Amino acid sequence: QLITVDEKLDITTITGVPEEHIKTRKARIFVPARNNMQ
Amino acid sequence: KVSPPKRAEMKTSMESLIHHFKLYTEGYQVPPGATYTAIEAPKGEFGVYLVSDGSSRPYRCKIKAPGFAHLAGLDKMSKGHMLADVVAIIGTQDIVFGEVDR
Amino acid sequence: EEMLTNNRIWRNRTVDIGIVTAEDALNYGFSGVMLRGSGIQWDLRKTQPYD
Amino acid sequence: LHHAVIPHGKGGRSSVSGIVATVFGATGFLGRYVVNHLGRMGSQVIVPHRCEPYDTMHLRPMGDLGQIIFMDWNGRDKDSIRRAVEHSSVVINLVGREWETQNFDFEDVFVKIPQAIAQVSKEAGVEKFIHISHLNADIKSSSKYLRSKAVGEKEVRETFPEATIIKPAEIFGREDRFLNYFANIRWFGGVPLISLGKKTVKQPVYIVDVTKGIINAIKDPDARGKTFAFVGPSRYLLFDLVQYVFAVAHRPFLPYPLPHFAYRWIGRLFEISPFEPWTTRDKVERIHTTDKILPHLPGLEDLGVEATPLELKAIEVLRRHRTYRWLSSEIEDVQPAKTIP
Amino acid sequence: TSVKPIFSRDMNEAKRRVRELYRAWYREVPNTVHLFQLDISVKQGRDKVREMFKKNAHITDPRVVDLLVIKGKMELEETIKVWKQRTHVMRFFHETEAPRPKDFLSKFYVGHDP
Amino acid sequence: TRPTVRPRNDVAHKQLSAFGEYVAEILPKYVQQVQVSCFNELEICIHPDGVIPVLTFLRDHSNAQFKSLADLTAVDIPTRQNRFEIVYNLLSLRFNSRIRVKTYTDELTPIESSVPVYKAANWYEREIWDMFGVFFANHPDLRRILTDYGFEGHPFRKDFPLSGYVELRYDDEVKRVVAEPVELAQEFRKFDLNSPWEAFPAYRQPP
Amino acid sequence: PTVKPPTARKFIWTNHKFNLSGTPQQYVPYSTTRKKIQEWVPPSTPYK
Amino acid sequence: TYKYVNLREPSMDMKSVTDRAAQTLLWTELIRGLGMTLSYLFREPATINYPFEKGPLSPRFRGEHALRRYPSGEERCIACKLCEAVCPAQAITIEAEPRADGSRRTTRYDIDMTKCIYCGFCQEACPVDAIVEGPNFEFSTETHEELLYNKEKLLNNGDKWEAEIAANIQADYLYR
Amino acid sequence: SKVKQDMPPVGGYGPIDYKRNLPRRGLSGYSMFAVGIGALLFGYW
Amino acid sequence: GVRTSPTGEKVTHTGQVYDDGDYRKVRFVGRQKEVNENFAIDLIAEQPVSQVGSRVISCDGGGGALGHPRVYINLDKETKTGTCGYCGLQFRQQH
Amino acid sequence: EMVRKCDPHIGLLHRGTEKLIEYKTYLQALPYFDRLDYVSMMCNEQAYSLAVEKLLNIRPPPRAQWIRVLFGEITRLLNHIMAVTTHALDIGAMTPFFWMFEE
Amino acid sequence: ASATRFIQWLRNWASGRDLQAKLQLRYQEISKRTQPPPKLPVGPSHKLSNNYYCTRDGRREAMPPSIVMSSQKKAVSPAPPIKRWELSQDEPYL
Amino acid sequence: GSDRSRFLEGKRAVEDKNIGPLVKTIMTRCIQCTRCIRFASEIAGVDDLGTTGRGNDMQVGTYIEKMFMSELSGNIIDICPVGALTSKPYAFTARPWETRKTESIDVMDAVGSNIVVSTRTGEVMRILPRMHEDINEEWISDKTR
Amino acid sequence: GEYVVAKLDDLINWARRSSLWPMTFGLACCAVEMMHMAAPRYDMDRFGVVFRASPRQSDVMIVAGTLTNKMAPALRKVYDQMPEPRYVVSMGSCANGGGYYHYSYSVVRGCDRIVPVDIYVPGCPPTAEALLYGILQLQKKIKREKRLRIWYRR
Ligand SMILES: CCCCCCCCCCCCCCCCCC(=O)OC[C@H](COP(=O)([O-])OCC[N+](C)(C)C)OC(=O)CCCCCCCCCCCCCCCCC
Ligand SMILES: CCCCCCCCCCCCCCCCCC(=O)OC[C@H](COP(=O)(O)OCCN)OC(=O)CCCCCCCCCCCCCCCCC
């Protein structure tokens, strides 16, 4: 039977990543530019 | 476009040089798909579940080692035996931990 | 084989050691000689030939 | 800074600390911790060694590839000292014996060799020089070991005026000749002590405290031309200390007084070994020398190091001296020794 | 927003599992120090257990809590059965880590990392 | 029969297609997709609730008899809402045939353990938990199998770095092996190999 | 090689050396590239 | 087809039964096994007398790497970096620039011999036969750092071993 | 020039054994036992 | 030609030499600096320039399949020589 | 000496082979298969080659297929010598290992 | 091969075989270590005409999977039942 | 294309031409696409490039000794599909697969041209244009490059 | 004085290098070529090299294969349990410097992060003959030890 969970998905505590490389990182989401040589 | 040309051809023919250059840098692209392929290896059924995303690098490559399942049955096969018998049961399963552990 | 097959010491160390039934071998995921030892007639070179 | 000595990385094995250090006497007790702490952060360490190469093997895993460099040297050969120090930014002198051999006496190891290193290091243009002396170094001391330390400490001062001089108390650690020394007396039954160990006070200091203090002096610009006294946090009566050593080791303690004269006779009998003496007359004098109190000198605290109590680390050293029956006793099972407030 | 539970249907159920795990970890420390011949004290080990529980006190997903308890139980089983070695038990204390200052100036001196 | 082109076997393609719709007809509660590849491999894609019913039917049904679990693995696809694809590769000795069964799950959702269907699954599911973090419910003895004791993270996840986060060495001071943040003397060199020109039109995705 | 000698080249070693590891002739690695970034060298005269 | 390895019912005639009782009591099959190792005792052993005798190798053998030259003495390597791209172990590191005469040549060519898997892919990828795996297999060292080859080391290997390298390439290039 | 590559000899290779060959040896059980008792009786005598 | 710097350290064919004050030369103390003394830049300049009759010549480096990929070199510019981009041999159109 | 439970702890030779392969081209990944069952090298290569050939939809020439079966069976002999003789060696019969490792 | 006749006899009797016919040490029956050069053949695609790559391109004839069912009459089995193996006539019982 | 050759003749060889210190020309690699000619005339507004001769011997170039030194000259390297026109400063230093691409912005002027900074092993290797329809399209100035 | 200790080194060195007992310790692929060095063609036993399973009765550790993080504490343990003098031979790329798993999250990048190494044998795997070259190189290292000469001059 399904339960009602009412919070944003956070898996940071169960990913095994060190604290430094979660809070101090800055991720860039982008579509790569076309390599101008081709 | 899959197998590299002969060295003599690569040093004479423009197409051969291009394909040699590209096969040893990018490699051949593989059409998207997934296969489980197996053989009668000396230790048992050895298979790979190989996933291609269309690029020249495999996306996933799960390796099926027969020794993985054989070793998992070691406790089952050893019921009611002594220390020296388990030494024999490990041998009769023919285990190499390069394939078991990967 | 002149050293092992008929040797009573060898046979004492191997006969009735680690018996596995045919049904257990299949359900446990065994293959190769771990199946054929129990009588399961199966060899991928015969049933699913390659090359 | 030359571009190749500018620090890089996050301070790990593969980083670059910028320190190029020549450690003389790195193959002994204190040396292995100093080299370990330099290699941890990615320093270039030159280890000039006198012993057989097999006896330096424990140093190899301490640095990334290329970071530990071994050279031969002779304490009397000043050419072999320039080779080892002339590319360095700091030179660390840890040379010393607790006994005199047929070839080197206390003057050799505590005066002539320290002076030669400093004089050659000065000529090579070495920026920094760290010299280890002794808390109880004194010209008027009954121990000739300590008399040479005083002469050598002064000589290194004129030769290399900007040298950091460190004066540790007795150091305890896994490979020390201190806690191990007392624990080994069990092989003779009772534990002989001058005046029953009721007349001597000691302030032993942990090996890692000394090592961290040395490493912080290299990096601290204000440690130049200074003299430091590295002492532990608590002062003990010798009898209380040695009794505590036997409690942590769980060995039966049978103290009995031995007069000063008769217990030099035993010290003279052990000096006859052509090997490493089990004890010497000078060792007897040092062990029974009261540790000095030198408030005018900065201590470990002035180098950012917080001294480690003997109670936290005694079991680390003395567990191997227990029998099977007592190997697994916890740290709490033995009450701390009485301290001198 | 209706998802399949792992064990606990809500936070109150999950928290009971947390306390059952904490008791098991609390009771096991004296044996771990005795069995592994650790030089730390029973207090030091129990403080470390508290520290590991305290860093996850902000979770409010019963599923995330259940996975943490699942991993905690597995973590305890390795210790009790001495599958872990002393090196694995002492990895919680980072004894060879040189402390990394956390203020702006100290970081600014040492490098570019924020 | 062109020498360099793999021959196409259509009798098997028809046979696998027939059995594929046979499975879908019998188990409409769970089967979401059935497909056959150009090299003749049948895949059944099912709802995760149907792991035990589908696998049990395939093992026991007289017209299936997939008695051997060849392989049980997972694939991580971060772009999906359910990133983990769980893949069962089954073998039928009786009908000399293979079938693949696929389901899905995410980080926080468990999957029923198939150990009751195939005892071979015991270690496969431990490997999937160890390397991907997918929890299997009612598993007899679930715990890491391949990674080091105390290892944190699930290495085969695409967002786990290749060299991990920590590394080991022997420290003489503490007289033991210690773990420290990973630093590499030579960073792994990332190569951008993909050609900017489409290779396989037949697989082109509509815009 | 008495019957079928190797082809001669002016760059081939005329003197074979055995394994020199553990001797003063041992190979020591080093980077073979030149300095990448050139630092600014301040003037030699005071103006300030 | 298949055969049975162990499915034979032994005969029960008093001669066969008496034969097996003799086997059990007189140890005849254990004596027979002693005959085999006795026969080996009087065979010439297969041991070669290393290092005065060597094991046989072929011209394809994959050993220590070396950078080759043209007969003029010019380097063959043109810094194409195909070997660096194909290296499964990422054991090759290259930097290049125009030489003083404009030639395309490397300024760095490192092989980390403790990363290398001695797979020979680099010499397959090279279009000019610059990098090869020579026939030398006896170059164990006393330090790790001695196995991190730079360009000077590899060029010396080429000059050291060129006489043999050329003869092996001559014997096998027609299979390539 | 004609193609030259590693090939079998034109006629093919000679036969290759593979079947188990463990030859029979020794004397009957009766003969072995008879020799032993004959030895014993002479020993006793 | 292999040169020695004022510090005495040999200069490699890539121009590398630890400058005076670089601690990294301690790695050579008690050992040696591996330097190849057959500078390819020097050796190729000793080859004679080959006079040919055609406007275009091809170079495979010699040895057929054992050389380099076959290229073709234009020789219309009479102020300079045609150089092979693989092996560095020079060619010249004779009148 | 009676065994009441066997608990095989593996991973002492786990080397993230499967994760490493994702960072390689198809050719670059082939040598990883030599080092799995490192007694049966050429058979592991064959299994991986068949999977890639199947995905590529190409066919190796007849001679290569015969060389593959030839060396696959030579490889099977290498495996079974190692399997049987090391199995005998563990059980105490050390001599066959020496006779058959010369083969 | 250098063993004397008496020793040849002795190890033949002890082993129960004729060991000399099948020695495990190799002598001069092996191939010479210097061979003549090969001249290897070329493949089917080495033609000057009627050889367009688009008629022999295996990768481009690969197609995506056929969707049999997507949730977006007689019973069948995956294949015909396997035939029962027959016993060997070469040597049925080892 | 096909995977092999059936050309059994000798190849054309063309002499090289100097057009300044920024663009190296290996004109034997030219495939006569005329992109460079059109870019120079239309985008750079410079009419120095063109074809001379005809047939197989048609040669792209300037005819006379002349340097193509526009502020937009370096862009002909990008639009040339082959290695006929390449960057002299960049020559031989890297290969495309091994570069890391950092998408950044140019500060040589106030136009804010979008660029890709190619790096390798911690070193800046070259600067490439980044397409932005509303700023620099797919070109950058020579100074930016 | 000098003459007596000089001969005494020659004697203890000769005995130690003529009687080298490696630990029965192999890790992966390279252990197969270690077996081939014990096999008849090379016969390590003829040099006086004899495998013994117990660390207490072993002089040399041949690290033959990949060292994982999980295995690393065990390898250090059995090394520490060898009596001295003891030697370590690093065999193959994996042991030498991680090799083809150098960038793996679970592999120690060279066994010399865990133990001191006397000899590094390159190859993947080194041939049986190459390992025999390394063992004989270790013997010649032991032939040069100067334990008593240095002791005499202390
Ligand atoms: C079947 C029976 C066979 C018996 C065979 C017995 C061996 C016969 C060969 C003997 C040759 C001499 C062996 C010397 C080996 C010493 C060990 C060694 O190498 O250590 C290096 C040490 C050198 O150590 P070191 O001083 O340089 O430094 C040690 C400190 N670290 C580790 C930090 C470097 O040698 C010595 O200390 C002294 C050498 C003595 C040589 C002469 C032997 C006299 C020993 C007497 C000991 C006193 C107790 C009496 C014991 C009874 C004696 C019979
Ligand atoms: C006039 C009236 C006369 C009255 C007296 C007449 C008596 C004559 C008949 C007596 C019987 C003769 C045999 C006596 C010897 C003992 C026989 C024996 O015990 O053999 C049986 C034993 C077990 O064999 P097994 O088949 O496994 O067990 C039975 C199965 N349930 O088998 C074994 O022992 C197995 C041994 C394994 C270990 C063997 C290793 C060494 C083998 C080589 C040694 C060869 C002999 C060397 C003799 C040296 C003498 C100096």
Ligand SMILES: NC(=O)C1=CN([C@@H]2O[C@H](COP(=O)(O)OP(=O)(O)OC[C@H]3O[C@@H](n4cnc5c(N)ncnc54)[C@H](OP(=O)(O)O)[C@@H]3O)[C@@H](O)[C@H]2O)C=CC1
């Ligand atoms: N309790 C303590 O440990 C205290 C130590 N100190 C001082 O700290 C320094 C190191 O202490 P510790 O490390 O315990 O001393 P150790 O004896 O443990 O090591 C001393 C070092 O000096 C070297 N050495 C000794 N004599 C000579 C010589 N004649 N020629 C060349 N090298 C020589 C040794 O090299 P080899 O190994 O080759 O002989 C060794 O590496 C010494 O100066 C000591 O006096 C000060 C206060 C207390």
Ligand code: SF4
């Ligand atoms: S042999 Fe293989 S692993 Fe070694 S350098 Fe060449 S390509 Fe790289």
Ligand code: SF4
């Ligand atoms: S060695 Fe060969 S493949 Fe490698 S960069 Fe040089 S020319 Fe290219």
Ligand code: SF4
């Ligand atoms: S852009 Fe390049 S290929 Fe096209 S005409 Fe100009 S030089 Fe030739």
Ligand code: SF4
């Ligand atoms: S890389 Fe392109 S332009 Fe350069 S030679 Fe090859 S095909 Fe021609």
Ligand code: SF4
């Ligand atoms: S070095 Fe090579 S052969 Fe040895 S274990 Fe590693 S991969 Fe296997």
Ligand SMILES: [K+]
């Ligand atoms: K271009």
Ligand SMILES: [Zn+2]
């Ligand atoms: Zn050329």
